Design a protein around this ligand. Structure first.
Ligand SMILES: [Mg+2]
Ligand SMILES: [Mg+2]
Ligand SMILES: [Mg+2]
Ligand SMILES: [Mg+2]
Lengths: 386, 63, 136, 225
RNA sequence: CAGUCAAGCGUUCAUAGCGACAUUGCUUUUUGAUUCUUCGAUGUCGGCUCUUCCUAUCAUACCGAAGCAGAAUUCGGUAAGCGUUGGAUUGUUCACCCACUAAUAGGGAACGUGAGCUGGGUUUAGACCGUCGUGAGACAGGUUAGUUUUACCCUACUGAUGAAUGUUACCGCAAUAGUAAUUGAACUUAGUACGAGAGGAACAGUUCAUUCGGAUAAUUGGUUUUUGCGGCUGUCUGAUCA
RNA sequence: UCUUAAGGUAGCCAAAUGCCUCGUCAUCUAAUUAGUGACGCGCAUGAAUGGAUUAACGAGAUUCCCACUGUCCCUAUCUAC
RNA sequence: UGAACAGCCUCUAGUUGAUAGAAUAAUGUAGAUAAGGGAAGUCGGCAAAAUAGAUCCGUAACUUCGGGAUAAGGAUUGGC
């Protein structure tokens, strides 16, 4: 018989299966659409999620009740050291899809990127790309034939880049390596840009700028095996229920005589790769700069790092992206920040944002002070200070 | 922005921090945290709580 | 709310479900209002329709004057006592739940309001702001 | 003229506007007709300031105004205070009030010479009113209505009071204020006359539902002809 | 539940909307009829929970017709994408009221769903009343009390590894499978179009909100074996400290 | 007036006894097939088949109110096994 | 300690027996806490919460005059 009262379906069927991701670095399944008129630029960037804080800014929405009034918003910080370009690859297009045909690497590869090609680095002869560098140090013979091959073929050019993990407070020492699409100029201009930028660093302000709406691609925080009540949000069974109550009561009818795929069941929660779109950049900070946390209104020389550092992460000595709201993934996780796939006007994506004040109090408790100078000025002298 | 003062302890309140409480006699109190808020709800006198600005002002400690 | 709204309202954390009894702040002779409905509330299985500050509700006078008891009338919530966030991010709350009586167009049955009212209610209903003593 | 105006449908103009002889204040979230009424009737001689008081569109009930001075609540922000200081002429004085009742338009009914206040205001606020506005103050209720600003409309020429007001209270208040007072209604019988309309020496603005006998009572008592 | 014909109703006018006397069908969510399967047992009410399907569409999208001036409404088409509620009484399905809402549409899946629950009802043994009976006893008459067992197997489903593709490592492609957003209010248009008046729209624009989903923990709240700090009771270590 | 052995008296009632029935009126609630108070041509109440009333008592059955709360809105967290 | 062969701790005496080790997923069993609301849940307040000792004040209808009654409802409590 029919269901007595209608109710919406628990959970989203388009995020199935809720399994663990294949890697800890989420894959960029789509890049922004190319046009061969703009200069040669990357479509995305890599960073490490550091943590969240608050800002105060003056809202500019002509018609809202909070027009020209101060609001406090939550932002999250992504530590972005300059990425190192080692390698390019070209993709021809077949009736079975895109297919890579060659890969041309840089000459000198650092230890932190060539640690990616090892599971046991400490017991190794470190022989990686040695015969490839021996293919180099001729005039050009085995090199520009592959480069002219990518020019002659290969309708899509992607650049192999790797992070500088040693510039971050993470204890990993093994960099992350990825492919980023180039979206400017012709194929020859793309591969000429890559050849000029082998063994060179690309900063985050070369690809991003303020008031830009971007996407965050990351693997979410893992939670292990989870029951159906928190994994899917189903209603808790009543108190006098024998054999437990964090369950789904009916898992299917008599016919069809099988459990359906659409029935909510227990399993892994979290550690899924997600792509969250439309996050506005509030600040592209420079690590070679004091007063990162200062605005034009605050004007007190303080860095973006809070008191006592970011909890479980550390310091923000490199460049960073301040982006509005929440992004998937927890702290210390690799995250890929991507340009928007479409042009959004919306009278919200076009809003110019100027910050007033950035919170730098401690996140390891109810912090009262933004700077140690302010803490010392408020509390006076102590016994430990003579 | 404006930095307000704690109604119980005199600590400085930054934007979006703590709570506010409007009593029935139309008086506004601002609490920097749940500790001072709970002491206010427990009706403790801030003149007798040793870490408050009003206590240190009364007892001439660091003044 | 619905019909007599003067503008829109941001989402306030809902604190008064169906069956809640709040104090009756005005001078109409009623002592408490018992909430039986919230105007503009949606539909979900098992979910109680809950009210926030500035909302218009349907209420009965459980305790008060006999010509006000035993009938349903519209009311407006002016004090919430469940903490909610503003867009300037202060979390604030009163110490009691309180509302006033009105017609469906929103003008007050009474004439004066005792105690504070919220600015999110005073901006949305002008008669409440007219008879209100203090607006916070 | 008692000018028919609505605030986006609202027939209460005293809630959303504050009119004195020297200046006018209007809410920022207003319609073209609502602004055009004050712009056409007031002209270029008198400044009209689009303002927000304490983050609220309601400004008439939040503030109490005079030709010599303006009183604002404590919750008024520094940006709004600076904007009012720049937009207003140098003659008027703007001073924040630190007082519990905090809704000065409801609390205070005032004109150029004499003012009626809520009985339970603080003495520092009474002295602040007497200093900034230069106005002598009486603590009185209009037939038991403590909100004298909401329940009275007052100008230099005359005053409109609450309809359900005792006659003895009418001559008492008339002798106390040295102006003639009429009990009457505004906005098709709404009791709150001060919230219903704003008035000064040569202009009164009221809601569209204010009927013709009510408008005639307004122009008679305020001598706008 | 749907047709065909059209005497009439509809001021006039069969068919805008209806439609008598007749007549052709469809459906198996009614109840019958039958006794084919099951009596070395297929757990027979209702509710709660949860998924999917049907369309004979209540709402939402786009349209056609009117006895469509506007507003409101009615008839019909493509349409099952998306939603279809909170309560008082009753064990109920049903019903009947209160109220919100865009709307509170109808149904199926062994009259979905008891090794998922519950046990109010029915349907054992105790007991009371009324009627019937000489009596033992009877009563889809009323009332009260009455044990709800087992999964560790196979499949299915949800997640998790994994031999073999010379070895190992990194970066990728995308066959196929799944998929998601939803609805409302206010301001303005505008007291405008329309109308004799009463009344009174819509498109574009702006700001919010409802339902759903995916994350996240800067802030607020919750949680405390951080047994982290402080306090307090009783007893024990002679007291103190601890 | 007929009939019978004699025709239900005092009381009580939609009661644990009333099919119709969710009886009718009042009250209780926003709304009550529930509760209470009345009414009585009572299918089929009724006097040791005991009738009516009744303080105190009851792990008896039922209704309402105050207090109280994760029963619920709507779930979250902690400990031991 | 306390009214107390209550509960809690100790002296004499007697045990230290009950397969253990490592981690801390879901669902359980047992024990708990929850903002705002307060029975809207459910057949039904089932279950849990609330109250609690002692002293002083105060205590209704009804009644078989014995009760009801700890009715209801308030205040206080340490140490020196
Ligand atoms: Mg069903
Ligand atoms: Mg259905
Ligand atoms: Mg923290
Ligand atoms: Mg339900």
């Amino acid at each position: 018989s029919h269901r007595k009262y209608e109710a919406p379906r628990h959970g989203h069927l388009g995020f199935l299966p809720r399994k663990r991701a294949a890697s800890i670095r989420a894959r960029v399944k789509a890049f922004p659409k190319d046009d061969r008129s703009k200069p040669v630029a990357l479509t995305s960037f890599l960073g490490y999620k550091a943590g969240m804080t608050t800002i105060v800014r003056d809202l500019d929405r002509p018609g809202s009740k909070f027009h020209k009034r101060e609001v406090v918003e939550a932002v999250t910080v992504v530590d972005t050291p300059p990425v190192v370009v080692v390698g390019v690859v070209g993709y021809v297009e077949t009736p079975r899809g895109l297919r890579s045909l060659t890969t041309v690497w840089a000459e000198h590869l650092s230890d932190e990127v060539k640690r990616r090609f090892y599971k046991n680095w400490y017991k190794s002869k470190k022989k990686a790309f040695t015969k490839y560098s021996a293919k180099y140090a001729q005039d050009g013979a085995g090199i520009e034939r592959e480069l002219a091959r990518i020019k002659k073929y290969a309708s899509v050019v992607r650049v192999l880049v790797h992070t500088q993990i040693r510039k971050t407070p993470l204890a990993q020492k093994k960099a992350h390596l990825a492919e980023i699409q180039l979206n400017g100029g012709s194929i020859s201009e793309k591969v000429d840009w890559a050849r000029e930028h082998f063994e060179k660093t690309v900063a985050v302000d070369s690809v991003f700028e303020q008031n830009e709406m971007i996407d965050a691609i990351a693997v979410t925080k893992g939670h292990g095996f989870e029951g159906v009540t928190h994994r899917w949000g189903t209603k808790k069974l009543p108190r006098k229920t024998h054999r437990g109550l964090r369950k789904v009561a009916c898992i299917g009818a008599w016919h069809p005589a099988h459990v359906m795929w659409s029935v909510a069941r227990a399993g892994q929660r979290g550690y899924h790769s997600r792509t969250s779109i439309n996050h506005k950049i509030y600040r592209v900070g420079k690590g070679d700069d004091e007063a990162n946390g200062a605005t034009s209104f605050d004007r007190t020389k303080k860095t973006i790092t809070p008191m006592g550092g970011f909890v479980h992460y550390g310091e923000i000595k490199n460049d960073f992206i301040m982006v509005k709201g929440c992004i998937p993934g927890n702290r210390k996780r690799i995250v890929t920040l991507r340009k928007s796939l479409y042009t959004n006007t919306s009278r919200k994506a076009l809003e110019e944002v100027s910050l007033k004040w950035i919170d730098t109090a401690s996140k390891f408790g109810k912090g009262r002070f933004q700077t140690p100078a302010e803490k010392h000025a408020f509390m006076g002298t102590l016994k430990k200070d003579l | 922005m404006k930095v307000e003062i704690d109604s119980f302890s005199g600590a400085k309140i930054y934007p979006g921090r703590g709570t506010l409480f409007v009593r029935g006699d139309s008086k506004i109190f601002r609490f920097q945290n749940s500790k001072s808020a709970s002491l206010f709800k427990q009706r403790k006198n801030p003149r007798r709580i040793a870490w408050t600005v009003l206590f240190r002002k009364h007892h001439k400690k660091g003044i | 709310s619905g019909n007599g709204a003067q503008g829109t309202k941001f989402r306030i954390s809902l604190g008064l479900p169906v069956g809640a009894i709040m104090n009756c702040a005005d001078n109409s002779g009623a002592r408490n209002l018992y909430i039986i409905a919230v105007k503009g509330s949606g539909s979900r299985l098992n979910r109680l329709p809950a009210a926030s500050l500035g909302d218009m509700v349907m209420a009965t006078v459980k305790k008060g004057k006999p010509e006000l008891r035993k009938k349903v009338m519209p009311a407006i919530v002016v004090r919430q006592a469940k903490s909610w966030r503003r867009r300037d991010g202060v979390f604030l709350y009163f110490e009691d739940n309180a509302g006033v009586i009105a017609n469906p167009k929103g003008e007050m049955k009474g004439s004066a309001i005792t105690g504070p009212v919220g600015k999110e209610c005073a901006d949305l209903w002008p008669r409440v702001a007219s008879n209100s003593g203090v607006v916070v | 003229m008692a000018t028919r105006t609505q605030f986006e449908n609202s027939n209460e103009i005293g809630v959303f506007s504050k009119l004195t002889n020297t200046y006018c204040l209007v809410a920022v979230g207003g319609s073209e007709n609502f602004y055009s009424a004050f712009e056409a009737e007031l002209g270029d001689a008198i400044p009209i300031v689009h303002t927000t008081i304490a983050g609220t569109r309601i400004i008439g009930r939040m503030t109490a105004g005079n030709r010599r001075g303006l009183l604002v609540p404590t919750q008024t922000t520094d940006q709004e205070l600076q904007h009012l200081r720049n937009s207003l002429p140098d003659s008027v004085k703007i001073q924040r009030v630190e007082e519990r009742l905090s809704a000065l338009g409801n609390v205070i009914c005032c004109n150029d010479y004499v003012a009626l206040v809520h009985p339970d205001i603080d003495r520092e606020t009474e002295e602040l009113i007497s200093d900034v506005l230069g106005v002598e103050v009486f603590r009185q209720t209009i037939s038991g209505n403590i909100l004298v600003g909401s329940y009275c409309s007052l100008s230099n020429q005359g005053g409109l009071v609450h309809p359900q007001t005792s006659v003895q209270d009418q001559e008492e208040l008339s002798s106390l204020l040295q102006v003639p007072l009429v009990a009457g209604t505004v906005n098709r019988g709404s009791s709150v006359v001060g919230a219903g309309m704003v008035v000064n020496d040569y202009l009164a603005v009221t809601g569209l539902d204010t009927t013709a006998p009510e408008l005639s009572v307004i122009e008679s008592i305020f001598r706008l002809q």
